[PDB]
Symmetry: D2
Subunit: 407 residues, 4 copies
């Protein structure tokens, strides 16, 4: 015995791993690590839900074996073929001598392409298939493009458990298995960060999945990342997804994202920020030299209005701002939102036009003022006052936006 068995509810065990050390994960800055949660269901047909990424294969296998001999597992349910939940299967899928791998057709296709699994036995399920595992039954809820074509939730009607896989997840390494055992506001913070960064462009798919969830009874949501959900905290998590899925998740908040070389665009950004704050909005300033794209997604996600700024560098915007806009564009996080642009230049104003074009045509933001504010080389008190006034207007627009899109 060198693992602790962790029964979370009667007959359902956490057999995942905590990734204490991960700091960059597919470009997400996981400042608090993550976990790859897998579950063991102690029933007539002993069942494993999901796997883990491949450096942790032996730890995963050890926790399963502590519950049930690997050769007595009957079913391994795979919700999603992504490596963080999957990749252990490439070299380890055989240790489940007598198991059937249970998944949808699209999941089975991706698993084979990724990891091979040439000798595996399959059971291909769908949204009408009911799988008897003894006392319990399992249903399968395809959630295509939430966030992959193969994404699935597994639902146990008897215990009222949703195995939501990436759904309801947070990149959060902890020894606690439930949200309510932590600071719930901290878990909700990471839950929103996960939503912004991974799910941002899939609000429509979320509406569909929440609609399905609303037709069944759920007392527990066991996610594949971070902590799991029950009772009141579970209510909060569901409500946040619900508002987000309807575009009702924004706050009276302005975020300014920028980079700067000699600090003048930064000083203007501070004056604009005070203007926005004067309207009663929360204001956040994110400078790419001290921030990252993961935080840009987090804050733009629930901002009522945004500003992006850069001085002109080599006839365009700074690369860090190009990265941030690419990321926000891909994730659709500012679509329809008031968006302002400003920046210094030395001889030819190019960054601001480029930012404006990207916000308007790329992000489909509400670029209400295409001129923005530009200045040659240095600010002055009058320019600071102009930035402040633009901030007042931006904060007013954020408040009006939130009212228009209110929950």
């Amino acid at each position: 015995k060198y693992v602790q068995d962790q029964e979370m509810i009667p007959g359902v065990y956490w057999v995942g791993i905590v990734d204490w050390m991960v700091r960059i994960f597919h470009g997400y800055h996981t400042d608090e690590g993550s976990s790859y949660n897998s579950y063991f269901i102690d029933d007539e047909c002993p069942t494993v839900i999901d796997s883990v990424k491949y450096p942790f294969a032996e730890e995963w296998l050890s926790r399963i074996a502590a519950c049930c001999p690997l050769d007595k597992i009957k079913y391994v349910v795979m919700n999603h073929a992504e490596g963080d939940h999957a990749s252990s299967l490439k070299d380890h899928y055989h240790k489940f001598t007598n198991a059937t791998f249970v998944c949808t057709k699209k999941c089975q296709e991706h698993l084979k392409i990724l990891y091979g699994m040439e000798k595996a036995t399959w059971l291909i399920v769908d949204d009408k298939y009911t799988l008897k595992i003894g006392k319990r039954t399992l249903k399968f809820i395809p959630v295509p493009l939430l966030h992959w074509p193969d994404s699935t939730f597994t639902y146990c009607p008897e215990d009222k458990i949703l195995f939501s896989n990436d759904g309801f997840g947070q990149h959060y390494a902890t020894s606690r298995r439930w949200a309510d055992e932590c600071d719930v506001s901290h878990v909700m913070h990471l839950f929103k960060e996960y939503t912004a960064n991974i799910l941002g462009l899939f609000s429509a798919q979320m509406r569909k999945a929440l609609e399905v969830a609303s037709t069944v009874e759920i007392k527990y949501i066991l996610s594949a990342h971070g902590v799991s959900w029950r009772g009141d905290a579970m209510g909060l998590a569901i409500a946040e997804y619900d508002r987000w899925s309807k575009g009702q998740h924004c706050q009276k908040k302005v975020t300014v994202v920028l980079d700067s070389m000699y600090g003048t665009t930064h000083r203007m950004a501070l004056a604009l920020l005070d203007g926005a704050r004067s309207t009663g909005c929360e204001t956040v300033l994110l400078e790419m030299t001290s921030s990252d794209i993961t935080k840009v997604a987090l804050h733009t996600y629930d901002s009522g209005a945004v500003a992006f700024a850069s001085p002109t560098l080599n006839n365009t915007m700074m690369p860090s701002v190009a990265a941030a806009l690419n990321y926000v564009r891909g994730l659709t996080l500012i679509k329809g939102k008031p968006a302002f642009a400003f920046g210094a230049f030395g001889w030819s104003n190019r960054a601001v036009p480029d930012i404006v074009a990207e916000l308007r045509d790329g992000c489909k933001a509400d670029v209400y003022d295409e001129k923005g504010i530009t200045f040659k080389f240095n600010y002055t008190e009058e320019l600071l006052e102009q930035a402040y006034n633009a901030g007042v207007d931006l904060g007013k627009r954020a408040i009006a936006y939130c009212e228009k899109n209110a929950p």
Copy 2:
């Protein structure tokens, strides 16, 4: 005068005129992952008064905020609680701008301000713990808190408005547009409040006991700190309660933290087995590996652990440099003094890291090093070794629970 700052009246006649340091990430070696702020306050009274200054890069912003409230030549008093650069260094170049002001501080603070910053032509008013400064409707009192955390450290108290200007006290390195804890997630503010305590104040519990004793003697409705958000109502009660428990050594949790570094991951795998053992007792368990952590987080977690473990493979006849740094830091801050502490690690040919860690835990940190052998092994772990690690963790977890029971609030 063009308007480019928002006036921020926090309570009647008291304005925030500080700055938010959005970008700072390393601050005297503190990993300020969430930035900080240098809070300064303007009191609108018959003698217009400024409390504290800010770090020199932000001087013009600070002066701009003050001038929006009152012309600089009409400021009568600038009260300085602390001479450290983050609240003071703008005075070097800029103090002359307060044409008519007198700088008000204790003798120790004046000595330090002059050595650091010059202020050769400044007008001073030297105060002590018996001085009442009249500023109009309000008066101000001064509470020296020496070595909380500098010899010059002071609090300023206003009896009429029940305000404690606590300077570094009650601070958190937290950049936000919010001025009050209750406007934020209070649990998040408390997390950073604890990180600040662990990293800046850790060795000063006796001085905190003294300071809390004095504060207990007067009514406080507001604590306006010089870093991060300020305190009122219920949230203020929480902040005070944490300092009180910590000053008495009653701040610990049923929690085990393992701090380590590893080169090929075998010391890491043994750490995981130990952690599960500890978790089985009902303790929270945190693993901090120095390649993905930092000394600021080491201080945070060791602060409120009931027990700790430190681990390293042998590298060149000693422990890994990252673990030496973590131990230096923890020793200086006294965070694990008296606490159950365990050590383990791999070696190739000569076991040196674990003996060196044990000696440092026992003689440097003055931890409760109950097992001076620890667990060592050559090159690789086995299932038997993982089991031994797990069992050592169970015992460590039990010792953490015992330590907390003995020191309970």
Copy 3:
């Protein structure tokens, strides 16, 4: 005495500062720090050439004072108004009680806007003005947009010194003042990095400035960054600028720039790399998770061909690759060069089309194969062979490009 006087040639003293600690400088990764070199000319009219960035004002003033009382300086020549050479003047320009600030009209304009300097005495020079300073005279060579509109070189005909300011510079912190006292190949390395990152888009302006330099005699080039140049090493530095200015600076070299989340685009990149290597080219692989835009500029600068790769992330390329392309585009470093693109996708191939468009229309590279190589989810031996073959073709194209554009 707490500074060492550093006479570099008779009557000419280094009075700059070494910035040992700087690691990020206007977005340039200065892994080896930098220096802001200023010079004191001991003549009848004691003269200072350039200033320094503003945290180092007192150290600069101290080294000058060690040579000559600050109130006995007659001239302060300013080549360039950028903060790294300038910004000390804002709060310190007055310490030169009896000095005249000598610069071109555009330099004077930028200095005032930046730093104020309201009480300063000016002498506005131009490309025909000769300034007597005693034994020596100074001439002024405007080098507009090398790299700023105000950029200037100062030339002393008697001593045959070119004070080239940013010209001939390298971000290199050392106690050595001359290239030949270091490892010259190391200095040339940083010299090329500086060229790629700061001067990349100004080859035309470099041809003009080298033409002017070719009309006068230069024994020493005293730069404002890093080490200075004489004799043989000086010949190397001049020759590299000359080739670069004519587009003759490329090597038989292929650089592949990419990011990857799960490593399949990375494995394909390795096979492509071996294909290019087989043709006799040097091959460099730069992965954005372990590289930076400064290194991307360095390597694309002298590559004969390039490849950019990314899997599809949220219907576009990864943000780090968007940043790299923005930067390379701004700097014009791959204009006209063979350029290939490839990458994995899960369901909709978008990164490769976006990379192709950016390379073709943005960078104006020679995108000879717009399809590139794309694959769903995972490589296979046949796909690796396809990547290898594309690499052979890319390396052949790099060699043909170098031959076409040969020195």
Copy 4:
């Protein structure tokens, strides 16, 4: 079989089948700013032979390169010089793929390979310094180099082709498509060759003396290393000459390095004055501040300095944790043993960092701590203090020059 690797014949019948690790940036705590490679070699002879393996993540690439030269079932010998994971860990999962191979190594290497990696069904041939392995036209000899840098470390020598397969020996953490030093900037390769020596081998000069003695007895035309580029001709002469000087303690330069950390920059400014003093003597001077440097660079520079200084302000009654790490690392590597060493630093109320640095330099590093007082000051420097620092630097520079003269090659 699809073709997706280039065969890379380095010399007649000897092929590079290693991997270039383009992305590695931290390697067992070494800051590998330029990546590395794990070089393995295939010898085309009557008994097809592989020298060394690679780190497990790169196993399939390594096997692909080998298979392009020879089917895996036709490999007769796999020679293992060293059991460390970077050259060996692919064997854990993959060793069975060499169906017909015998693993050839010393007894110590076999013991370590089995403990690390299992290899339960492997066929072994245990060799020693008197064994000649016939592989066809060629024979192979084995040169144990214990503690250069592991107990199992070995070189393999081919007498017919005059090849030394030196494994970690002569290595550099350098990722490049070039296989030979002379195809690169040789000065750059030598820089990294020195960084490798300083960081990996620093404490093993005696073992290097032994190894060079043995190598001197045979003719070597090629040194094929397991990291970075390999050596031939003139460049090979340079590499050998550096190891020779270093093994004899003759590797130092007229060079002073100052290693420090600072919180508010006054210790930093004094460092600059000291550095100018040192520079005035004709020494090169390098300043390394831990917030912008790393222990790998500290090792690099202290390696070939004739004198050093270490500095820190007092933080919580001791030196800054970053400086404790740098000293731990330097102590373990023995890089400043016998070298003139100076200490200085600011303090606020109680001078603790400088005494702690002096004790560590003197008793831990066994440096020549000629002035145990150093320079300390409260809070801030003055022109007089800068002058004192400058003078201490002049003296340190003179002592560096003297140390180099005494130890000259």
